[PDB]
Structure formats: structure tokens, C-alpha cells
Ligand binder design. Structure first.
Ligand SMILES: [Mg+2]
Lengths: 1083, 90, 91, 90
């Protein structure tokens, strides 16, 4: 049997796990520090790539062997990112045939590394160790021709004592790395399969008698005031005889020093234990990361450990941090880089953390394996909470109790080693609040036993494992955790007494254009007991930077490396793009995660609630601003004193107001620079309507002309000509001073380009009739009507699915056009993706201005982050470049927008609001292309003017729908807007006057018999140019009896019948809200 | 003059089968004219109830609707005044 | 002597003499009789045998008065049952 | 057995927390009293006048039950029963 096919052999020749001491982060300077006796093995090694382990040249590990024709590779790296082999992406399926513990012998990518190193002479009066921070997935080690041993877990270190087999001067190190092993059956994470020496390698030397390990723990009293330190120091003797001096020094965050221990110790293998008291220590939190330092010295051996005073506990099902209720505002993060794969640098790690804190994130889950040691040091220094997770996932093996590797006796020691190596390495970091056992790896005795070992070793952290709580309550975890739960699950957990808090380890799947209904989850979490937050899936899109044939860059995903089988773009799930450019959905996360709440009491009085745990609002600069039709007219600074949990009143003196719309914005910003952001960074804001506008209706007196021929109706007003087709029934051209404005006709549109969530719930199949109804239609009828000051053109269409759509254009003598749509869906059609109009203009229309939510895109279930103001952009920056192209660029709650070609403006205003978008290509182009690079060049702009579009959803991306309140269910709808083509932007608040009244007739029987039914008939005639929505209410003897909603298109009559039951003998008044009244007699 | 009311809808998020849902509505008139309004409540797209209200200037009116007969599952509650909510029946 | 890692009473020293050879543990099991075997008690009630050997310490605290100290331990067991132990030592 | 003065800052309508360090307690019954008094003379009353107080049980007592070993005598006649214990006759 091969050692790389044997699950019962976890390693050979390795030292026991201990806490990280190298490198060390100094919390006073922020600089990395190394020992005096230290040799880096990072840099160039001689490298040889083979298709399997049996195609390697024989005797490759000997000193005599000649490698002068070998290629050179840089360490650390993944070799798939250096040119050798190909990267493979699979979600759940293994990239070889599943048959544990067996891996293929034919295709098993193999790498051999060789390097010569110079050990100084003075090192040999000491003990010498070789340290590998990480290797994927399995390796053999040879030193000066001799075999030392092997190791199997990709994400935790491997250390080897070499003092015997090494010699002064020049020595050889040789490593053979295999991509696949039995280890690979527990490394089935939804991610790219890579291989190689992808983390640092080094040599160091310790005295014969040295400190092997340190465990520092803290306790706090019942007032969270005074502290205790509990210190375990493990010593190891390798041939020393003389007695050495042990000193332990405590350094405070201020910089003061104190000797805790100073004693003489005889050389022996022993664990020394100490307990000390500390008065009023500075406590560590994510808001205030105060670190103490322990300095330990035994003879000439020196080590340092950073620690903080903090306490995590459960009281009556509530999660407490230093005595306060803690909300987890988290994200899942993969350790990934688009150029280097898993071999991520410190510069990139610092970029990730500052971006997270600038968007109000307080917690990170290391999904789904331990990260480099420097990640946890930076979370201690900058201030983030961490959920540290063991490298165990076996999704591809069935979770049935007989099949799952979690219940098999031969996999028991592999599960135990992976959990124990994480805990022993990471146990001193104050940032770590939870230990996670793994992810999607089934349930059984292999997890139960490892979880009882952690709790007896470390009583200061909580245990999490979603693989057990998905089956119900489990005795060996402290937290109840579920993945992508619906709202009813949260409301059920909160409806009874619970001993454990509820956490969502993954929620709000951010694949593509997503993260709908985020505020609805957080309105439930902040109102109901036992709900303590969750982690968004996930931080960064795993897209690999690649070049196409023409040499233009794109982000590559599954099946872009000839890799088969693959799972396509299911690795693209981020809130930031691979290079750390934010997606628009990261602005919604920042708004929902903010720690200040602001409520309107009255128009001049606002209540401010502080939801920070340990920060006073006096640390922030307050500002308020008033906007008039979207422009700033008044700004003022303030300061407010509020302790954690306090509500304080803020009084704002308002000006006298005219007929404009007025909005108030209140914000809080950083008073001075922090380690993570600059002075003036906004941490929280809220906006409120002060006053609605007064709309003006103007009587137009000027005239309009009309010319008919065999194919066209032509309408002239001022210096604009509108051309209508009698064969298509569409508006086909607009000529302004003899210049063409349209490149294609104005058409009704019901379709949006499917998102990753839409594909996952089969929207393109279910709703396929609405895509057909957007491209084909039958003109049933067309007529026109002229008055002194206006002409109306009315078209009636029937659509695929048998629905009806009515369009009406009214041209006024001032050049304004009113555009109206009514949609009457058929009885058996499904929900509607969008309701609006689509057209195209020439690419000379290159600038857009709007008054509405911005500056970024917003949707029906993702718009709280959109501030109401006046904005201006170029057309090319009015869309986001999603890795897989999709629906993008929507602006919500818009009062008006204008497209400009320098001279001519196309102006649109809502009645009272619209949604819009502008694209430099067609809807057909956007639906076709599957990469950013393939988006073609076009000589036109597509314009969408919409009533509404359905929500994005994203509870998950494999079946979940948008919530009921963000869908267009099939009932009658109407919608109108005004368009003007001129040289200047007119007033959005001024419209042309029209008649606004329906003609009504009520009728019934004059006399009925007791027990009989009265039938009341109503006719409603609309002779106006706009569709009317009306609630028709029937009253019987002054009391409301029945109500009907009606939509009446222009130039149409609707008929209703109400049935009235239970009328007793006598006379009864029947009346409506439309001024009709009758007496009825019951014989 | 401005012609629009300020509205807020509120209710229980979750109820038991057999129980009654109470939907509360506040209407604030900050305009200089009295408003007459028909407030219509829809349950799963179908008209359920209607109230006639007269709101004098500078005044707030409060309504309660009682909704009976909701079976297990999730239900959309909405009005003719642009308020919408999902309700869960345990 | 109480353990903060196990939550159990581990030793009693009377005039410097050890009284316990193993800790005081909660116990839910009896060695099956011939009648127990005949009605499949060892299969049906197997969770109570596990709950007698394995437990998870959820919480542990103590409280001192003038004349006594109380030590309180909270455990969760296999099968998801809860057990509370309290020791009060008097003067 | 213990008295202590304090001052608390609270504006009209505000709630503020007050932390009282408790002693170790024996088998007696313990009650806490919290009061507020005038800091200095007013036109209507003198310094030290109490305006508000409240009391709370801290700890219930532990009752003792003692075994009596001493004897009791009994004499009957035509009209009286007489019971003697220590130096009392019932
Ligand atoms: Mg995304």
C-alpha cells in the first residue's frame, strides 16, 4: 500500500503542533519580526513536472543526480499559475472517479523541487528545524539523500527536526509534491483545484533547552472590571545539563513593563502553570483592539505573544461579548488572488481588511480551511472577529450514516489531526471567538469525539458545525447554525424559549447581480430574541485573469481551460470583483450594517440611537444637509453625546419652503484618521422627505397639424415631427429641426436579461411567453382624434399568451408628448419580468443627467443605499461589468432624466416617477455574450423607460424566488410619462392640462322580493387621453358593502355588476363614491 | 398645492392558524385641504375590505383592519396607497 | 477539588488522605438483566448508556456566602437532554 | 449594618443604572432601602427631608428547627387540665 492512499497514516517524522511564534507582529510599530538564527528558503528552486509519480526519473533525490537542465520555479507558488498543468473547477463532484481511499495512477500531476543551502558552523551547538507553512496536497522530504518522512493536510504547517542528518557548509533539500491523495477526499471545497509549495519555507535554530509551547488565557470578573491571566509554559530538554533562568514580562498597551515571573529551572520536560491578577485592564474588541504583550526568555531562547482581555459567553440563549449583546455582521472570505491563486501576499491581505471595515463588516469566516498565520495577527491589530474553520469537507461522498466518512472507523484519525493542528496553532489570538469543525462533511462519531476534545482543551471559545444542526439539536455544539434559511425558519426559532443563539453561517448568496431583501433579514434579527446575525456568501469572485485571441483581458471561470467536467460560473459569488473593485451590492451591505439608527419624530425633530457596543457617538462629526430639487441649499455641522444603547433628540431649524421638493440627509463621519480609514469617511447616514412638491398644470393654446397617407400618419408641433406607421401601429421616427432622433421604433417591452438567480429558479423557461410578447405583436385596431390644441394616436395590440396592450400618444402644441400604456393580462399567463418601453437613439447622445436615487444602480428589493439627488455621467459608466454579463444599470424612483448630444436634449419626466437605464448595445447582445471582453461596439444607445421590474432575490441561487412583495403578479397595470425634444431642460414640475373625469351610469331593479338578490350594474366611460385606475365602492344604507379595482384604457367603456344579498323588507339607499344614488324597495 | 398623504402600514410578522391578523394604518395630512380617501385592503391580490376616511388638515387618522381565515403558508397584504408586506401563518 | 475543564468533583482530601479513586459522575445505566435482554432494552435505551460516559460542559460558576460555597455545573448529554449539578460545602 | 451616600445625574424622563456592592451574608433576613433627600434648605422644607424611597428583599432567612429533649407534666381534675414546663404552668 502507498502512503498517499492510506487514510490511517496522517504523517511521519513531523514535530508535535504548537502555537505560531514566527513571524511576530509588533503592535507598537506594525512591523514583522524574525528570530536571529533564521534562514528563508523562499526564492528559486530547480523544478521538474511529471504527469504522474511513476514518470519521475529514478534517483532524483540523491546528491550525485544532475538537475542542471531542470526549469527554475519561484517559491511560494501554485504551479498551475506558472504554466504547468491546468486549473480545474468542480463544485461537489471530485475531478477523478470517487472510490475512497484510491486516487488515479495515470493522471496525478507531480512536482519535484531541489535546492542547496549553506548552514553556518555555530548552528550545530543548537537544535535545527525545517518549517513548511503549507503544501497541497501531499509531499515526501529527502535531506542529503536520506528520507525524513511525509505530511498530508494542505492548510496547516509541517515541521521536521534535522540536527542529526544535516552537516556544516552545503546541504541538499528535495521535496516531491502530489496533487491528489487520500487527503483530497476531505478537501472537496467549492473552489479551484491547485497544487504546489504555496506558502513560505524556512530554517531556524533553538537552544538544547527551549520553550516548545505557550497557552495564554484571560478571565474577567462579574462586573467585566478586573482581570486574571492563566499561563501554561511547556519546556523541552534535548541534552542540556546546566540550570537556566526563566523571565516573563508583561507590556501594557501604553508601553509600561512589569516582571510577572523570575526563577531558575533545572533542565527537564515539564509544563509550568501560573495565575496573575490585573486591575482595570483595557479590553480587546473589534471597535477598540487593545493588545498586551507577554515576553518569555529561557536562557538565550526569546519568544513574544500578543493577547487581549475579552470574554465570549451565552446567557439565557443570548450571545454576550465583554457583557454586551453581540450582532455578527459578517462575510465568508476565500484566500484567493486572480494572478497568484492561493499564494496571497500581506499587501493584498491589508487591502481586504481596510475595505471590509470601510463597509461596516465586523466578522470574517475563513471558508473553509485555516488561512496563513499573518491573517489572524492583522485581525488582532485592526479589529475583526474571526470564525476559524478546520480543513474538512467531503460533499462528494453521500451523507447517509453508513456511507459518510464522518462515521467510518478508518477515517477517525484524519478528522482528529485536521481539527487538532488548527486549534494548537491558533489558540492565543483574541480575534478568534468560534472554532468551526468543517463544512458539508456529514455527521457522525468522528466529529463528536473531536468536538469533546476541543472543549476540555479550551473553555474560552464556542463550537460551531452546520453539518450537525441541519439535522436538528446537537449536544456537542454551542451555536445553532443553518445555511440560506427562509424568513419563516427565523420567526419559528424565535417563537419559543431556546438555550442557544441562532447564527446564519451563509446567507444572501451574492452570485451575479444579487443581495435582494437584505434589510428584511435585519428588521427580523433586531426585533426578535435569540437571533444574533450571520455571514454573507461571499467576499471575492474566484475569477482568473486571462487574455483572449485579440489580447484583451477577461476574468476566466469553469470551462475556460478545456477542464471537463466543470461547474461554469458557480465559483463567481462575490460582493467585490477579483481585483477588489466593489460591486454595487457592497453599498447596500454598508447601509444595512451601519451602527447608528435615526428616526423622524416630527419634520424638525430626529431621535438618534447608538448601536455600537463600546463607542460614544461624541467620537464622530455630525452633519445635516437640505436639498431643493436635488441641489444643496443649506449645510450644518453638529456633535451629539450618546453612550452605547442611548437615544438622543436632534432639533433642526427648517427654512420657509417654496413649491419645490425638499429632502433632509443626516450623516456621521470620522473626526480624525484611523489605521483603516481617513478623516471624513462616512460610517452612517439616513434621508427623509421634508415636503412634497406642488405640480403645475398649464393650458396649451398653440395648434398641431396632421397629414395621413397610405402607410404613415405625420403630426407636426413647433419644430418637431412625429411619424406613426398604420401597418405596425408604432411611433417610428421623431424629426427635430430635420434631424433624426430614433434609430429604431418605440416598442412595449416585458423582458429583462436573466441574472444568475433567474437561471437558478428557471425564469427563462417559466416566463418564456413574456420574451416572445416583447418581439411579436398583432395590431388589432388603430385610430386618431384631433382637438384645437392636441392630437391623440391610439393603438390596440394582442400578444403571445393572448394578453392585450393599449398605447396612446398625445402630442400638444408646445411639442410635449404624453405616452400611456395599459396591460390587461390573459387568465392563464405567469408573472411579468418588467413593464415599460424600449427604443434606440444615435451614439452622439453620450451624456446623461437625472434627479432620483444614485449614484449607483438600484432595484425594487435593493435600493436603501440610493441617496435622492441630482447626478451626471457618461453613458459608458451607467452599467457594471459583471464577470458573466447580465441585467445591469437600473436607476429607481426617478423624477426626470435627460440625454444630451451637446446641442439637443431628450427629456423624460415621470407622472410622478419612472425607472430607467441606458446601454451602449442591444438587449440581444447582452443576453448572447458570456464574457466582458466579447461585448461588441455599436453606433446606438438602447433606452429603457419602466413602470417597474421584478426584484433580484438571492435567498439562494438554485430555486429561491424574490419575495411576494417584489413580484408583478398578472393583474391589470397602467403607466404614463412625458417626453420633450428641445435645446434646454424644462421644469419637471410643469405639465400640460387635460380633463381628468370619467362618465358613470348606475342601474338596477326598482323593486325585489325578500330572499332575492339585487343586481347593480355600472358603466364607466374614459374619453380622456390617459388610462385611469379607480376603486369603485358600493354603499348600502351608509355602510361599505363591496369594492372593485378597475383599469380603464383611453376611449373605452367598462361594465361591472355587484350582487347585493340579505336586504330585509322596506326601502334602502344604494350609493357609490362616484356620485350615483338610488332608493330600492324590498316587497 | 401639494396633494399627497403620508402613510404607514404595520402588523404581526407571524400568526397561528385560527388566529386574527390586525393591520394598523396611519394617514397624516400636512396639506391645506381636507382629503376624502377610500382605503382598500388586498389579501393575495383579491379585494378583502374597504374604509371611507375624511382627514382634516394638520391631522393624523388611525385605522385597524381585522383579517380572518388565513390558512398555513405565506400571504401578501397590500393597499391602494403603495404599502406591501409578507405575513407567515404558522 | 473541582475541575474547571470537566465540571466534576475530582478529589476529596481528609487530613491529607485521598478518598476518591475516580470523579463523581451522573449515571443513567444499569447492567442488563435476562428480562432486559429479552425485551431489547440494550438497543431501545442505548442513548442512556452513552449519556453515562460522555457529556459536554456548557457552563460552570460558583458563589460564596459567610458560611457556605456553591459550585454549579450545566451539561448537555447524548440525546440532547440537560443535567444540572450543584455542590454546597458548609463550614 | 451598612450606609452609603451617592449622586446620580438623570434629566426629566431618563432611566439610569445604580450598582450596589453587597457584603457576604449569614442566615439572617437582609433588606435594602434606597432614598433621595433635599441637598439644601428650600422655602417649604429643611436639608435632609426625604422626597422618595423604595425597599427590596436581598435574602430570605434560613429557619432553624431544634429537637427538644426536656419533659412536660400533665394533671387532670374535674374542671381543669394543668400542663407544667420549666417554670410556666398552662
Ligand atoms: Mg455579486
Amino acid at each position: 500500500p502507498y502512503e498517499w492512499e492510506n487514510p490511517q497514516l496522517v504523517s511521519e517524522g513531523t514535530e508535535k503542533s504548537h502555537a505560531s511564534f514566527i513571524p511576530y507582529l509588533d503592535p507598537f510599530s506594525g512591523e514583522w519580526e524574525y528570530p536571529e538564527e533564521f534562514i528563508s528558503l523562499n526564492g528559486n528552486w530547480r523544478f521538474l513536472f511529471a504527469k504522474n509519480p511513476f514518470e519521475v526519473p529514478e534517483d532524483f533525490f540523491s546528491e550525485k543526480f544532475d538537475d542542471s537542465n531542470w526549469d527554475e520555479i519561484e517559491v511560494p507558488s501554485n504551479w498551475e499559475m506558472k504554466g504547468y498543468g491546468k486549473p480545474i473547477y468542480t463544485n461537489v463532484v471530485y475531478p477523478f472517479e470517487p472510490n475512497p481511499p484510491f486516487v488515479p495512477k495515470d493522471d496525478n500531476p507531480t512536482g519535484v523541487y531541489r535546492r542547496w543551502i549553506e548552514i553556518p558552523e555555530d548552528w550545530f551547538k543548537k537544535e535545527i528545524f525545517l518549517h513548511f507553512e503549507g503544501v497541497r496536497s501531499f509531499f515526501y522530504l529527502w535531506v542529503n539523500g536520506k528520507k525524513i518522512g511525509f505530511s498530508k493536510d494542505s492548510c496547516t504547517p509541517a515541521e521536521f527536526r534535522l540536527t542529526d542528518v544535516l552537516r556544516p557548509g552545503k546541504n541538499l533539500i528535495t521535496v516531491e509534491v502530489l496533487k491528489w491523495s487520500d487527503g483530497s477526499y476531505l478537501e472537496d471545497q467549492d473552489m479551484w483545484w491547485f497544487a504546489g509549495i504555496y506558502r513560505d519555507v524556512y530554517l531556524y535554530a533553538l537552544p538544547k533547552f527551549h520553550i516548545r509551547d505557550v497557552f495564554v488565557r484571560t478571565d474577567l470578573d462579574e462586573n467585566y472590571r478586573n482581570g486574571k491571566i492563566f499561563l501554561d509554559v511547556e519546556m523541552r530538554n534535548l541534552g542540556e545539563e546546566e540550570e537556566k533562568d526563566l523571565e516573563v514580562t508583561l507590556i501594557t498597551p501604553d508601553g509600561d513593563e512589569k516582571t510577572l515571573v523570575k526563577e531558575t529551572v533545572k533542565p527537564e520536560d515539564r509544563v509550568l502553570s501560573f495565575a496573575f491578577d490585573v486591575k482595570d485592564p483595557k479590553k480587546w474588541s473589534a471597535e477598540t483592539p487593545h493588545l498586551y504583550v507577554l515576553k518569555l526568555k529561557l536562557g538565550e531562547d526569546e519568544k513574544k505573544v500578543n493577547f487581549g482581555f475579552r470574554k465570549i459567553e451565552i446567557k439565557d440563549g443570548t450571545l454576550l461579548f465583554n457583557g454586551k449583546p453581540l450582532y455578527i455582521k459578517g462575510v465568508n472570505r476565500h484566500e484567493f488572488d486572480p494572478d497568484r491563486g492561493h499564494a496571497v501576499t500581506v499587501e493584498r491581505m491589508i487591502q481586504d481588511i481596510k475595505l471590509m471595515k470601510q463597509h461596516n463588516i465586523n466578522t470574517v469566516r475563513t471558508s473553509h480551511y485555516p488561512n496563513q498565520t499573518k491573517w489572524y495577527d492583522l485581525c488582532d491589530y485592526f479589529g475583526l472577529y474571526v470564525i476559524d474553520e478546520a480543513n474538512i469537507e467531503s460533499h462528494g461522498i453521500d451523507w447517509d450514516p453508513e456511507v459518510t466518512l464522518a462515521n467510518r472507523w478508518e477515517w477517525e484519525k484524519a478528522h482528529f489531526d485536521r481539527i487538532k493542528r488548527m486549534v494548537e496553532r491558533d489558540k492565543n489570538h483574541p480575534s478568534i471567538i468560534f472554532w468551526s469543525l468543517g463544512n458539508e462533511a456529514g455527521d457522525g462519531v468522528n466529529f463528536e469525539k473531536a468536538a469533546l476534545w476541543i472543549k476540555k482543551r479550551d473553555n474560552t471559545r464556542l463550537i460551531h458545525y452546520e453539518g450537525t444542526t441541519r439535522r436538528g439539536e446537537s449536544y456537542y455544539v454551542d451555536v445553532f447554525s443553518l445555511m440560506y434559511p427562509k424568513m419563516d425558519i427565523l420567526l419559528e426559532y424565535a417563537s419559543k424559549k431556546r438555550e442557544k443563539p441562532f447564527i446564519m453561517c451563509e446567507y444572501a448568496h451574492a452570485m451575479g447581480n444579487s443581495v435582494g431583501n437584505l434589510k428584511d433579514y435585519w428588521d427580523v434579527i433586531e426585533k426578535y430574541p435569540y437571533l444574533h446575525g450571520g455571514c454573507i456568501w461571499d467576499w471575492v469572485d474566484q475569477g482568473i485573469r486571462k487574455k483572449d485571441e485579440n489580447g484583451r483581458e477577461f476574468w476566466a471561470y469553469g470551462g475556460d481551460f478545456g477542464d471537463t467536467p466543470n461547474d461554469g460560473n458557480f465559483c463567481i459569488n462575490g460582493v467585490v470583483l477579483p481585483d477588489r473593485t466593489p460591486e454595487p451590492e457592497l453599498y447596500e451591505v454598508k447601509k444595512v450594517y451601519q451602527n447608528v439608527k435615526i428616526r423622524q419624530v416630527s419634520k424638525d425633530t430626529y431621535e438618534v440611537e447608538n448601536r455600537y457596543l463600546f463607542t460614544n457617538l461624541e467620537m464622530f462629526d455630525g452633519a445635516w444637509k437640505i436639498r431643493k430639487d436635488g441641489e444643496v441649499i443649506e449645510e450644518k455641522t453638529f456633535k451629539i453625546f450618546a453612550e452605547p444603547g442611548e437615544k438622543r433628540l436632534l432639533k433642526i431649524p427648517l427654512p420657509e419652503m417654496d413649491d419645490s421638493e425638499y429632502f433632509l440627509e443626516i450623516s456621521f463621519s470620522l473626526s480624525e484618521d484611523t489605521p483603516w480609514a481617513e478623516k471624513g469617511h462616512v460610517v452612517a447616514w439616513e434621508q427623509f422627505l421634508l415636503k412634497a412638491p406642488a405640480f403645475e398644470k398649464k393650458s396649451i393654446s398653440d395648434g398641431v397639424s396632421l397629414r395621413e397617407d397610405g402607410k404613415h400618419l405625420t403630426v407636426e408641433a413647433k419644430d418637431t415631427v412625429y411619424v406613426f406607421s398604420k401597418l405596425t401601429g408604432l411611433l417610428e421616427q421623431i424629426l427635430h429641426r430635420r434631424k433624426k432622433i430614433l434609430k429604431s421604433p418605440v416598442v412595449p417591452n416585458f423582458w429583462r436579461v436573466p441574472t444568475d438567480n433567474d437561471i437558478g429558479n428557471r425564469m427563462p423557461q417559466r416566463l418564456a411567453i413574456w420574451k416572445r410578447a416583447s418581439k411579436e405583436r398583432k395590431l388589432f385596431k388603430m385610430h386618431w382624434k384631433k382637438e384645437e390644441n392636441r392630437v391623440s394616436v391610439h393603438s390596440v395590440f394582442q400578444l403571445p399568451g393572448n394578453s392585450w396592450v393599449y398605447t396612446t400618444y398625445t402630442v400638444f402644441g408646445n411639442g410635449d408628448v404624453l405616452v400611456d400604456l395599459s396591460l390587461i393580462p390573459a387568465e392563464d399567463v405567469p408573472e411579468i419580468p418588467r413593464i415599460g418601453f424600449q427604443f434606440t437613439v444615435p451614439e452622439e447622445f453620450g451624456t446623461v443627467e437625472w434627479y432620483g436615487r444614485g449614484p449607483h444602480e438600484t432595484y425594487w428589493d435593493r435600493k436603501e443605499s440610493g441617496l435622492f439627488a441630482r447626478y451626471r455621467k457618461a453613458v459608458g459608466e451607467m452599467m457594471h461589468r459583471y464577470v458573466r454579463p447580465q441585467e445591469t444599470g437600473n436607476r429607481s424612483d426617478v423624477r426626470w432624466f435627460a440625454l444630451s448630444d451637446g446641442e439637443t436634449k431628450l427629456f423624460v419626466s415621470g407622472m410622478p416617477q419612472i425607472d430607467f437605464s441606458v446601454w451602449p448595445f442591444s438587449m440581444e447582445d447582452l443576453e448572447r455574450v458570456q464574457h466582458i471582453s466579447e461585448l461588441p461596439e455599436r453606433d446606438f444607445v438602447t433606452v429603457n423607460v419602466d413602470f417597474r421590474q421584478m426584484g433580484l432575490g438571492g435567498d439562494d441561487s438554485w430555486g429561491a424566488m424574490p419575495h411576494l412583495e417584489y413580484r408583478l403578479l398578472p393583474k391589470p397595470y397602467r403607466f404614463s410619462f412625458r417626453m420633450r425634444i428641445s435645446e434646454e431642460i424644462p421644469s419637471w414640475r410643469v405639465l400640460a392640462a387635460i380633463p381628468e373625469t370619467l362618465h358613470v351610469e348606475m342601474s338596477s331593479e326598482d323593486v325585489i322580493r325578500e330572499g332575492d338578490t339585487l343586481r347593480v350594474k355600472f358603466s364607466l366611460l374614459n374619453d380622456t387621453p390617459l388610462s385611469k385606475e379607480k376603486q369603485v365602492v358600493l354603499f348600502v344604507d351608509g355602510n361599505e358593502y363591496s369594492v372593485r379595482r378597475v383599469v380603464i384604457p383611453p376611449f373605452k367603456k367598462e361594465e361591472l355588476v355587484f350582487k347585493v344579498e340579505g336586504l330585509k323588507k322596506g326601502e334602502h339607499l344604494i350609493h357609490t363614491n362616484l356620485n350615483t344614488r338610488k332608493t330600492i324597495y324590498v316587497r
